[model samples]
Target: HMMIVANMSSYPPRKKELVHSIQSLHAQVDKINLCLNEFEEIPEELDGFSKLNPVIPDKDYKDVGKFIFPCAKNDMIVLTDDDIIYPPDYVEKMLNFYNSFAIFNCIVGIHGCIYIDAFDGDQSKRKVFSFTQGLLRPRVVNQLGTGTVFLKADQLPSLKYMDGSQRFVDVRFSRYMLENEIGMICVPREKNWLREVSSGSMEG
Candidate 1:
């Protein structure tokens, strides 16, 4: 059981990319819990999509909305971004690698990062090697990009502790796992397995 969870802002600039991003996931997953911030009503374009559950929060929780949305306890939650164009086999590949290990209960992600020095609770002092700096192999890492992550809900701690602010959801999420002693694995994939929708695209 897998449930894809994502958040989108009502900002006019990215609605076009949002629809396309949702459509791509819609085709591959059984359920998607989409959190909409600052929207009075569901957008017409996204209203009728099968398996799309639009959740509008009274106050925008920003990136943390992905974890706060409703879903089954046992389902694997794949947190994603609204600006990325996922591969046709995105969910399939995530699940395949996730289920491959019988003894390891871990979080899997496409993009990952490592803290070069020991982290001492201060995010600013830590140096990192993320996906942009260089290509990383499939291995245990200190942080995994939340936009491209997969984890089992049952294995997680209460997600309410995540910051509701606009930044560092990935940082906090990684710390949560570290406290729980959960392994975070970066899965191997082709360089182009995932793509991002152009920020300046005119397509709706």
Candidate 2:
């Protein structure tokens, strides 16, 4: 099974559009499940799956981690932003990689850092820095943009949403995982994972 958690506040103007995009992606897969924040009403398209309510207010990136870390029951848990576009066979490829690596516990898809014309000039490339080495350990979770990580649910600690306590939860969670000796693998760039850039106010 595969699970996805999205914060509704991130898709303000294009909320319905975003939901439709997600639904379109999931419609082709049978085992995948979705969990969305309840700040808004459930879309008619997503009538059957589970919904997480009471949208945790004031929570940062780590807050999202706290929300999802405990509820994950699948062999792999994919934590992503609401604006991401998953390519066909994304889950299939990632899961295949996980199975091939005997010691692997985490995997991250390389974010396309270019302004692609296919995406209509979307500046969705990942921010590059000195730390873009690969397969980030938990120690690196405290850094920005840890939202796109995939890992085994059992490898994480009990989550506690702490809004305002940490600026970015992805970084903190990465740090925690690395500090605990969990394994992290970075997926190759050819996988074609897409991210749409947006400010929290406009998207959220």
TM-score on alpha carbons, each prediction:
0.83, 0.57
Q: Candidate 2's residue-wise lDDT over 66-179, tens digit each?
A: 343344456455555556555566666656666655354444434312122346766554434222234332222223344445556665445453334454555555556567
Q: Native-vs-model 2 lDDT?
A: 0.45
Q: lDDT by residue for model 1 over 1-204, one digit each (tens)?
A: 546543333333567788888887877777787777767777888877878887777677777767666557777777888878877888888888788742587878877776675467645444343432333356777888888887777654454677553588788888888888888887877666677787566754
- Give the range of the ten consecutive residues with the poorest summed lDDT in model 2: 135-144
Candidate 1 weakest lDDT stretch, 10 residues: 127-136
> Against the true structure, candidate 1 has what lDDT?
0.71
The superposed Cα distance between candidate 2 and the true structure at residue 113, in angstroms, equals 12
Clashing pairs in model 1, backbone N/Cα/C closer than 3 A: none
Residue 144 of model 2, lDDT score = 32
